[PDB]
Amino acid sequence: XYXXXYX
Amino acid sequence: MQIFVKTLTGKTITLEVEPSDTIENVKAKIQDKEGIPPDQQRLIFAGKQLEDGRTLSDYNIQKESTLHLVLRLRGCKXX
Numbered sequence: 001x002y003x004x005x006y007x
Numbered sequence: 008m009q010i011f012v013k014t015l016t017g018k019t020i021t022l023e024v025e026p027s028d029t030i031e032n033v034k035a036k037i038q039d040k041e042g043i044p045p046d047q048q049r050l051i052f053a054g055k056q057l058e059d060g061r062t063l064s065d066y067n068i069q070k071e072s073t074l075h076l077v078l079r080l081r082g083c084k085x086x
């Protein structure tokens with residue numbers, strides 16, 4: 001991880 | 008045309024929209040009637056989680072329809 005979203 | 012937004016509280020609210028108004032505009036129209044932040048609304052209709060950037064006509068939502076105002080589910084996809 002280390003980013004975000006949400007998809 | 009006119010639509011209805013039934014909520015968890017069970018209180019039906021009469022909204023007055025147009026075929027051109029986007030879903031987000033509808034959500035924001037609720038912020039004018041109640042004060043609920045649009046960024047906290049999730050309109051469900053016909054077992055579908057209506058997208059923000061998309062008009063009513065795209066969903067074929069016809070006159071005198073009833074949507075559901077639930078709370079945005081924090082997704083678990085992502086990180």
Ligand SMILES: *[C@@H]1O[C@H](CO)[C@@H](O)[C@H](O)[C@H]1NC(=O)CCCCCCC(C)C
Pocket residue numbers: 006081082083084086
């Ligand atoms: C990310 O969202 C998940 C739910 O979808 C949570 O379970 C998870 O704990 C969240 N992790 C976070 O770090 C949330 C944001 C925390 C603040 C980030 C500030 C940035 C780095 C400037």
Ligand SMILES: *[C@@H]1O[C@H](CO)[C@@H](O)[C@H](O)[C@H]1NC(C)=O
Pocket residue numbers: 005006007079080081082083084
């Ligand atoms: C995360 O993305 C999903 C995509 O299905 C969405 O349903 C949910 O509202 C999002 N959660 C947020 C923006 O916190």
Ligand SMILES: *[C@H]1O[C@H](CO)[C@@H](O)[C@H](O)[C@@H]1O
Pocket residue numbers: 003007085
């Ligand atoms: C979720 O998955 C998509 C796949 O395209 C990535 O682009 C995104 O950054 C995240 O990993």
